[PDB]
């Protein structure tokens, strides 16, 4: 037997389904989503790190002028300053007081901390969902883990579930993602070869093992001061170290739908968007003929207490007469009311208690207990506690499953208006007919 159903993508709320194969005792399966994962496919763009400026020892020319050698390097800059008079500890270094020149040169490299402290800029463009599911099949809790692309089917207790694909393509990640350690940020980094000084991406490397580093930090060499033999310069500070100070808040704290984010690999977990098609496939040998299961008759319902809380604030007590001792599968026939029990033991002339949860303020629902249905009715009362730490177990309220009994006020006032309108229309048509016959 093949059964196909849809459950919401909410994690932690169990949903019941009715595998009703006529001629056999109905079977109710309660399934809960323990976790749902979205794993985007990532293509690395370039690693960003902290640059390291390499200044070799300056070359001073004694009694002469040096020339600016040119070579290809990440951010190579070379300058020659004339008229310097370097002073070391034991006296002046050059012989003459002028015509001495200092050759300065500097470039940038990836720091040795590249292999540890780096931020990776990615592109995320498609997501392969996974899911861990808890299914209560035949009165046993069995947990399954499967891919939610609609392709992986997991066989548990001889019935196989094939879950997915999710109804919504939404994902917290944009087209361009940067991760640092365990935080991932939705940012539009500059393309490779177009970084700006003092901003994220001033130094860019294709991979953490590549060598063709692109760096743009406006390294400017400045003239040594007053007989000192140092090499001053003016460089825009590391863009990456500036980013670390001004990151903001990761996706983990700002993503919508209560999304949880992680890394290694980057995933988004437990989104609350859309719903999840799920298909069961039960062997024909799992079912039980209707003439072997207990058959309940002479059934009646009373609802003593009823509070429309988030948890199960309702109680209904059902009188029955049972043909024989056995289990029965209790299922609510109304979407507005959620029943906590999935099956209950039954024997003789007795009563059974089921706990339900509703958002209705006038609970009217049908409960089916092993092929027999009964009608339920109560007037709910609001709870006192304004806030709870758990999500609602019941379906949200519609504008039809609305308006408690004692909405009869609506019927009465609209009926009075309709009667006035009907009387006015009757008088109008009577007068119109009398003046149309009259001539």
């Amino acid at each position: 037997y093949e059964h196909v159903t849809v459950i919401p993508n909410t994690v932690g709320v169990p949903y019941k389904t009715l595998v009703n194969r006529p001629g056999y005792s109905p079977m109710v399966l309660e399934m809960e989503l323990l976790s749902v994962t979205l794993e985007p496919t990532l293509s690395l763009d370039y690693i960003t790190c902290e640059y390291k400026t390499v200044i070799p020892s300056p070359y001073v020319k004694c009694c002469g002028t040096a020339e600016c050698k040119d070579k290809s390097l990440p951010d190579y800059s070379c300058k020659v300053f004339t008229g310097v008079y370097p002073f070391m500890w034991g006296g002046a270094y050059c012989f003459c007081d002028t015509e001495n020149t200092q050759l300065s040169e500097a470039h940038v490299e990836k720091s040795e901390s590249c292999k540890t402290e780096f931020a990776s800029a990615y592109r995320a463009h498609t997501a392969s969902a996974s899911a861990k599911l808890r299914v209560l099949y035949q009165g046993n809790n069995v947990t399954v883990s499967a891919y939610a692309n609609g392709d992986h089917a997991v066989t548990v207790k001889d019935a196989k579930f094939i879950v997915g694909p999710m109804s919504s393509a939404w994902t917290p990640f944009d087209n361009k993602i940067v991760v640092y350690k365990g935080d991932v940020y939705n940012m539009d980094y500059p393309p490779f070869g177009a970084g700006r000084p003092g901003q994220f991406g001033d130094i860019q490397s294709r991979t953490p093992e590549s060598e063709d580093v692109y760096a743009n930090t406006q390294l400017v060499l400045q003239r040594p001061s007053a007989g000192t033999v140092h090499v001053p310069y003016s460089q825009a500070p590391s863009g990456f170290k500036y980013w670390l100070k001004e990151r903001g808040a990761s996706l983990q704290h700002t993503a919508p739908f209560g999304c949880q984010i992680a890394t290694n690999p980057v995933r988004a977990m437990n989104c609350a968007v859309g719903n999840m098609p799920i298909s069961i496939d039960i062997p024909d040998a799992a079912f039980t003929r209707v003439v072997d299961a207990p058959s309940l008759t002479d059934m009646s319902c009373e609802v003593p207490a009823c509070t429309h809380s988030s948890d199960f604030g309702g109680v209904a007590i059902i009188k029955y007469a049972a043909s024989k001792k056995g289990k029965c599968a209790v299922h609510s026939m109304t979407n507005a009311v959620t029943i906590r029990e999935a099956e209950i033991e039954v024997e003789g002339n007795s009563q059974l208690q089921i706990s339900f949860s509703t958002a209705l303020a006038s609970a009217e629902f049908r409960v089916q207990v092993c092929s027999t249905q009964v009608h339920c009715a109560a007037e709910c009362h609001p709870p006192k506690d304004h806030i709870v730490n758990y999500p609602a177990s019941h379906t949200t309220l519609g504008v039809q499953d609305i308006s408690v009994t004692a909405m009869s006020w609506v019927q009465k006032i609209t009926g009075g208006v309709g009667l006035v309108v009907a009387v006015a229309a009757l008088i109008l048509i009577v007068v119109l007919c009398v003046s149309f016959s009259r001539h």
């Binding site: 704290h253 700002t254 209560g258 609350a272 506690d385 304004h386």
Partner: protein, 53 residues
């Protein structure tokens, strides 16, 4: 190793949470709706404070 802040003193009201906080040092408080529009907000609290979310 990093420390964990003291548990606040929560109190509820109609569509509200009243939180009394006891920070020993600058502590970050952030909160977001768990719907379509998260409306993320944050602030550093440095002394005893009461918030109404």
């Amino acid at each position: 190793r990093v420390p964990k802040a003291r548990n606040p003193t929560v109190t509820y009201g109609k569509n509200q949470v009243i939180m009394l906080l006891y920070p020993d040092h600058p502590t970050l408080l952030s909160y977001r709706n768990m719907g379509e529009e998260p409306n993320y907000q944050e602030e550093w609290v440095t002394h005893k404070k009461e918030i109404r979310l």
